[PDB]
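Q: I'm a student working through a structural biology exercise. My instructor gave each of us a protein and asked us to get a predicted structure, then write a short paragraph describing it. Mine is Ligand of Numb protein X 2. I'm not confident about reading structure output yet, so if you can add a plain explanation after the tokens, that would really help. Here is the sequence I was given:
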Amino acid sequence: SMEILQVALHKRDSGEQLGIKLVRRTDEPGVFILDLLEGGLAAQDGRLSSNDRVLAINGHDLKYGTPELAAQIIQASGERVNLTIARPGKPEIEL
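A: Happy to help. First, here is the predicted structure for Ligand of Numb protein X 2. I'll explain a few features afterward.
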């Protein structure tokens, strides 16, 4: 299963970073969150997580996107950055 959610971050100036490390994978399409940076907007917000898939940013489709496309979109954004996220899998497993 997977959870779809939306997370809105608000830049305090046009050059502020979100504080997210985005990666591609060779074995599946998409843009994924690897980690959040210490003290950044995303970390402060507390909703995004390692291994989330970024489906869209501000209505711009990223399903088959790249980290560089995401960067272009974020760097050119207005103050509000709204991300649509897919979060797969079980959070707890006994094995």
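A: Here are two points you could use in your paragraph. The first strand starts at residue 2 and ends at 10. Residues 10 and 80 are 5 Å apart (CA to CA). It's a good idea to check both against the output above yourself.
Q: Great, thank you!
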